[PDB]
Scaffold this active site. Structure first.
Site, short mmCIF file in Angstrom:
data_model
loop_
_atom_site.label_atom_id
_atom_site.label_comp_id
_atom_site.label_asym_id
_atom_site.label_seq_id
_atom_site.Cartn_x
_atom_site.Cartn_y
_atom_site.Cartn_z
N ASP A 77 -44.04 1.84 21.38
CA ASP A 77 -43.93 2.02 23.03
C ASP A 77 -44.98 1.57 23.76
OD1 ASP A 77 -45.36 4.29 22.88
OD2 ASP A 77 -43.91 5.52 23.58
N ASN A 113 -47.53 10.16 47.05
CA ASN A 113 -48.13 11.30 46.13
C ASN A 113 -47.87 10.73 44.63
OD1 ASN A 113 -48.21 14.20 44.71
ND2 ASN A 113 -50.00 13.81 46.18
N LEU A 116 -38.58 8.46 21.19
CA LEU A 116 -39.60 8.68 20.41
C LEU A 116 -39.55 9.46 19.14
CD1 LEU A 116 -42.86 8.68 20.50
CD2 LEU A 116 -42.72 10.91 21.48
N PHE A 171 -37.28 12.22 30.99
CA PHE A 171 -36.68 11.41 29.76
C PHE A 171 -37.95 10.68 29.08
CE2 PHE A 171 -33.67 9.49 27.08
CZ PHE A 171 -34.38 8.27 26.69
N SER A 224 -45.95 16.56 44.31
CA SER A 224 -44.96 15.69 44.60
C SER A 224 -43.36 16.58 44.62
CB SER A 224 -44.73 14.86 43.34
OG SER A 224 -45.90 13.76 43.58
N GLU A 228 -35.56 1.36 29.60
CA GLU A 228 -36.14 1.65 28.10
C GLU A 228 -35.65 0.68 27.13
OE1 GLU A 228 -37.89 3.85 27.38
OE2 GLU A 228 -37.94 5.52 28.64
#
Ligand code: MTN
Ligand code: CL
Length: 162
Positions: free
Chosen positions: A20, A132, A32, A104, A117, A11
């Protein structure tokens, strides 16, 4: 290595408001602020989150406090979610970090949508789950980061991050 260092790598750290990868207003370590295109809305969210009049700039201590809260929230979102909790429970400690990383980045709802998945991860079919996982908007929009998280799911090691 641990989840905090992992997400710090993915990040980054910016002490002023920025957009972002999706064009959303964000600050600190991938926190965010808002999906609204208004910079003022973003500044208002920032002031609210930090509890003072900031004018778009925060300190490193403040960025890290937001980070602590976000990681704690991500973990607890997983534990309260009925699709996510069983998967988390079944994983080793490294792969758990990988799941937290996804949540996250894209939220509890978003990850819970990787239905197929998730089932392969629970069955511990690492290679199959990896393939996948790569068939996703997530992989195509942020390939390098997705690759790192996927490799972590595949190997159960921190090698994508060293
Ligand atoms: S994901 C990186 C990776 C996994 C594995 C299949 C074990 N590999 O050989 C490499 C190092 C490509
Ligand atoms: Cl990327």
């Amino acid at each position: 290595m641990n989840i905090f260092e992992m997400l710090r790598i993915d990040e980054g750290l910016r002490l002023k408001i920025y957009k972002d990868t999706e064009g959303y207003y964000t600050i600190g370590i991938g926190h965010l602020l808002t999906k609204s295109p208004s910079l003022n809305a973003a500044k208002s969210e920032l002031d609210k989150a930090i509890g003072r009049n900031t004018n778009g700039v925060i300190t490193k201590d403040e960025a890290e406090k937001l980070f602590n809260q976000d990681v704690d929230a991500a973990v607890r979102g997983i534990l309260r979610n009925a699709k996510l909790k069983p998967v988390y429970d079944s994983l080793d400690a490294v792969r758990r970090a990988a799941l937290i990383n996804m949540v996250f980045q894209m939220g509890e709802t978003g990850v819970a949508g990787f239905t197929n998945s998730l089932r392969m991860l629970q069955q511990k079919r690492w290679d199959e789950a990896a393939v996948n996982l790569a068939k996703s908007r997530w992989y195509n929009q942020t390939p390098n980061r997705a690759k790192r998280v996927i490799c972590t799911f595949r190997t159960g090691t921190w090698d994508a991050y060293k």
